[PDB]
Design a protein around this nucleic acid. Sequence first.
RNA 1: AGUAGUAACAAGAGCAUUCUGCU
Lengths: 740, 251, 704
Amino acid sequence: MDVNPMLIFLKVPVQNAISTTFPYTGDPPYSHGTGTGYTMDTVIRTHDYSSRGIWKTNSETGAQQLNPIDGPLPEDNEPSGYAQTDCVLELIEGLDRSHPGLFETACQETIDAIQQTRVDKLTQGRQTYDWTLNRNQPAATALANTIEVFRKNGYKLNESGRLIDFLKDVLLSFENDSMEVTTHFQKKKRIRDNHSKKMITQRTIGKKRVKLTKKNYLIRALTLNTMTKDAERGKLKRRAIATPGMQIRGFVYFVELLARNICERLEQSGLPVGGNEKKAKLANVIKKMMAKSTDEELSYTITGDNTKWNENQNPRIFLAMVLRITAGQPEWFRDLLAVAPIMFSNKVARLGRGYMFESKSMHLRTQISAENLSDINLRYFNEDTKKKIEKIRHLMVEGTASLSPGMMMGMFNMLSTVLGVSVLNLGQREILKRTYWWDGLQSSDDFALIINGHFKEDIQQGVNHFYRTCKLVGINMSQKKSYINKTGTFEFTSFFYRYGFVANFSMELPSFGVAGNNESADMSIGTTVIKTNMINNDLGPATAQMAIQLFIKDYRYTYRCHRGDTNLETRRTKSIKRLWTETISKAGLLVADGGPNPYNLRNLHIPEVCLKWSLMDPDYRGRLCNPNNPFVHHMEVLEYDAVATTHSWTPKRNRSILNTNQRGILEDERIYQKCCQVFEKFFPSSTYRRPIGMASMLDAMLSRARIDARIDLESGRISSQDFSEITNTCKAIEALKRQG
Amino acid sequence: GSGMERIKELMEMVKNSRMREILTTTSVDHMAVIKKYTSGRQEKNPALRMKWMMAMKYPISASSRIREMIPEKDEDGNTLWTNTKDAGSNRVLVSPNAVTWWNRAGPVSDVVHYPRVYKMYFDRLERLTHGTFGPVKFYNQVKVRKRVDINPGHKDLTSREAQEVIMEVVFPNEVGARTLSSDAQLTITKEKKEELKNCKISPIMVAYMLERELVRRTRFLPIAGATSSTYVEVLHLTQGTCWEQQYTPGG
Amino acid sequence: MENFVRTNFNPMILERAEKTMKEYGENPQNEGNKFAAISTHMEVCFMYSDFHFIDLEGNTIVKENNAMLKHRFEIIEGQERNIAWTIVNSICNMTENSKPRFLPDLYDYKTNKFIEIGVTRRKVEDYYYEAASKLKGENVYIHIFSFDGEEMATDDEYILDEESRARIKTRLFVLRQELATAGLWDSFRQSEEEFSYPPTFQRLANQSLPPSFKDYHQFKAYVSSFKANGNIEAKLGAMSEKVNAQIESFDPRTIRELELPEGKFCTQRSKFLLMDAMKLSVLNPAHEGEGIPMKDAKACLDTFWGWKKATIIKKHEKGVNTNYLMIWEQLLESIKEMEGKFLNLKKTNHLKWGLGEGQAPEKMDFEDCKEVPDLFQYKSEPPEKRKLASWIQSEFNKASELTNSNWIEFDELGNDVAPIEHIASRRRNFFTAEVSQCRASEYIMKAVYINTALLNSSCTAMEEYQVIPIITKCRDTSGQRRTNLYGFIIKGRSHLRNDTDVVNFISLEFSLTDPRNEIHKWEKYCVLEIGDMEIRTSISTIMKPVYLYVRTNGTSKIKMKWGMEMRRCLLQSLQQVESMIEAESAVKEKDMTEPFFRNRENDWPIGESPQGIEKGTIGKVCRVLLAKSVFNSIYASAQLEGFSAESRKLLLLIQAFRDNLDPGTFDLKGLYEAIEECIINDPWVLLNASWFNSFLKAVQLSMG
RNA sequence: AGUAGUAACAAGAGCAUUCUGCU
């Protein structure tokens, strides 16, 4: 008897056992090497779907740009990029006619949020492509480097503290033909390693001030960093995603804020909803289109994906959409929201980290960069890379490839939803005046479209009308990955609807293991992860109990904190056994101290020290919650009481890089940390609530020191000798500020 | 000698040229950006790195004061801390046997503000321990994303007022142009200044304690049942996908 | 003008006024009278605060030339906003004064009063009473100066001396005369957002339009003044008829099967032996190491008497096999003489070959490689296709069966209080009691132990050739511990900097299986014959040879990380089964745990016998789901994820037909090609494709 | 050799979306 688990589907429905078809327990497919080939594949496919457009050169960057929109209509079901401007403007006008006052209210909220948003909002989010370093620094590091390069040139409107003045500085920086940037360079020397007697070239990364051009800074400002996406499920082959620079982040923030205010009031959008709100939206679109106005109404549902969703939507269509949504608004707001589609239409894509070339005679290898690929003879490649380089050769501008058509993955994630919801909103009964109608639900690129009609020919006509109207605006429904059935079972973004029952499998199940901060922090994070998956990610009760047991087992292995009555002999088992043998109430000991597991389904919201506080020994709770413990950092006032337990220690950190002397670049972080520490010494509320100001840090600290000395003199504990010494030292600090 | 230590520290910092440039050029609004400045290779898997760091003898880095608080060797011969190679700074490498030794044979103290700082979680545990559970009822579930009250806060004080109350209590000089505009606000402020007279605690700790007592938070959540504040905390327990546990909180 | 300010005022006053203007966000081109007025008011406040001291006794002594005394006035105006408000709050907290509504301009410690000083150009009476109505209630000393040559205060009191205000009014008359000479007196006396494009971004804005437009202003005026006149219907008339989504009807009784590839047979690619694994065990170990894995390995090796001289039974066809034989002899000789907890083998030539040391080409920088002629690119080839062999179905058969041991010992929970905690405990205990003695739990524990010890030895013994035994620990039916040893893993050098850097190792696994019966399963292995063992049964007792499967394998931090977490398979198999119980309870409206887990009939189809479809119980179904999750974790690849994601649509199409929902596809042939693109050479994905074909044939024969 | 799979690792930049003990 050969065992076949798929025969389980002969008894239960497929949606009742769909979790068997998700192999999400093994390692997800990671990419090896570079993301150069996938970037060139994205660029070539984006220019090949759009090849019947108009080729032009940019007046500023010199880059070859392709203009597919308002082009020839498609003649076959290949994915087209030829979107029509009149159809896009008609769909946005129809979305305005169906929802009156939506555009005005969302634009008014965007204007209310533009004037009150600071530059520090750009320190949030993902890692940003630093045009200074040509690398993906974090958001605050890239923003600080951009502000430093703006301030060392003649651009200082970002000292106003609001975001829109930084964006005006970003736009004014394009006129400087002598942009002086402080990059990172690298020295090298062949030093013998004193562990294996081997010669290795050690590198010393420092800093150097280099001067750009107008065209060089314009290429670096319009550059996305393209890398492969790793740990992506459900695909055989890898893909390249992109990361924006710093000169485009605030404009994209304001455009996506506008589109998020739009999508939060459109009921046909699957954004920005969570799990159970998406289940409620599936139920809402299944109840809206269940109304039998007559006795014979065929209701069909298309579960659909869109093929090449990002390669086919142009930034010019988004420019027309953001100029039509903001109709009747002030022209500064229209221009500010129109900056980001202009920068995305003139964009350029960095071509990754080159390739690796192998010398078999000399038995060596070398990774040559993507800038050196346009001056190496084409016989040194394989056939696919020969085809890719020969296709992309006329698009290269200074080590980057021009990508004027198409969008990259995840940039305008909420505006394309507005376009898709406009296509879904086209087909109402009181608007089409035809024998069919539809209503849908639109995520970023997945859709679930319900077409009602009276005969199956009317359903086919509604299918063709939706598909052709989508093709008019640059939306290609994947005929491979879409299917139509009757109404009652469908799928939308891995939410499986069957007859009033929704199964959520969009989110992968987490490890339910140790997070890796310390003992108390990982205990809190583990119970909060289990509780949040019980609420928002739809974890069962018994599955949550097994997750509690698996997390406690993993937590006891990782921190070597098995129970005192265990027969295992780890490193800490002797001290934990000593603590177990001298404790009266063993139920009060923490899991990190060898106690039992206190947690169950009902008390995952309660911290561990709080949960076992009434069962602890008083000497044990005194030693554990001792406010003079050496493990938690103690801020000087003598220091304060530490209200954190002794399990909230700090692990030893290793930020080292092999053969790399990164001493010249790790200094600025510790200098910034010393500055924030001494500012918190002067202003004690700087860590609780962020300090607002426009003067310098040194000027505010001297103004704090002078009046602190004056208040302490006039009210006690500082004498006039001490007051005079503090004021004379403030004079000396100001004197070194002047002639420094 | 109170305010001259930090002023001589600032003099020593302004003596350096790069720190002088950074302190004079970066404003108080830009210090909210350079606080999060991180230059260095980031650990892509902290879980795996903790797994292989805990297999080493000394994974903890605590301050040098631990060289005088705990011994260097345990009773069974376990070394508790070692120094670093040519680094006499105030940070040494510690063992987790040191943490277990502090929790079994360190100095006892007074713990009376730990149920006072974390009174929210003790109130949660006292409400759950005295709760009375009803039976489970299985049916299909319709859960609506409602902005429910996760943290209740205080009566007649909004979230915009309680934060100003806390900033007037624990940081009275660092307020700004904000003014207090209620008649029970001043009585609450006087009572909180009275209760926090003798606290040898960090001001952020009493700030966060008054925050988790007074500041009201709300969050969108799928609720199907009672939307009271003492039911959103047991939202992982009183409802599921196909069932609904009936539970009345004790109190 | 601004030059009139910069002619005769102090440069510190100019600095204060420039910072005051930069506060409000303006350039001195649009308003320079603001610069002159702020500088005038600031110099008036400075001369009000210049040379006013308080000594140690506490008397207002006007000095000239600080060391023994302090100031009398605290200057508030001219600072930043938040600095001045911190000054005001730090004064009011000490003196218990109420805070003013706005910022005062000075503070007197002598009178303890906030001074508001206002310089105007109109008459002093109207501006003084306007400022008094502005500050009605707050105890603020007002003082109004003008260019008319007067001064008006609160209650007509002057806290300054007469010569002081004489100096200030003298300077004000000097400024009045200097305004009425350069033609600037009357032009000073009678006194949305913006986002425009710079010209470079204007040229970028013109370049990013539809091709019918040459100007951004023109396109913006077109879009803002657009009215639709039936454009979509006109383009849909103009579009071709070949652009259509034609619904093809889906009938699974007519669709074809998946095309599995052809070539050689697929070989075994697991990291450890699954159903051919043999373990040397110790029962109740107490041998003075007792937990240290090399001590447990020596104690388990001491149970096997009957070694032989090892001879290569089955040769690895691509590699040198004498190196594998010498590797086994070196490992066996080094275990017999090692002292301590860990064993690092001496790096001989055969071990260097087996771990692949020296095979990487020397990575150099390209500027040192520019004059290198034969510098061809790395080659990137697709996998070679493989035919489905019958050993992987036998592995999945033996993986879903019970054993005599208990492989998972979960940790304790809290005591149950709620009724849903009792329901969850009953459900979880039913699934655990059916699943804990399975063979897939032994594979879970083998992978957890192997990848955990491989990670620890990879991170603490990077430069060394570490020996890692393959230990599991189980409990019997009577509750007695047992430690099993399956073989060894000689780790290579592991300097793992990426998530996908390869640590090479050599796995030497004990077995009883003759490798020459299924030789295509063992392509990468070199099998030796290391001994003989008395295999005992109820009647027969024979002497079968014990073989050792030696191969070179490799892993990474991603694969080891996901192998240490294989207990999540135990979670996922519980997440599936419970969801079935969370479906039957969503209709029948009771606790369906006990009808699920006590009706242990044979109504669950999980088998394909030659006589038809075999049905097992619910416990067999849970063991089969656990083994499917375990084999998803062992044989994970991109091919499995692609095939699962693309065949789930075909499964939902078959279910849409079975519910009589009339399913239809737009392009079924492309979906079939996308499914067949992923079935390349993974044995698990070929087994899953043949499983999908068998399920399709079963769902056809249930309808005809 | 081997891992692996559209390009890499098999040490010599990581160019990010003195230890190892799990009943």
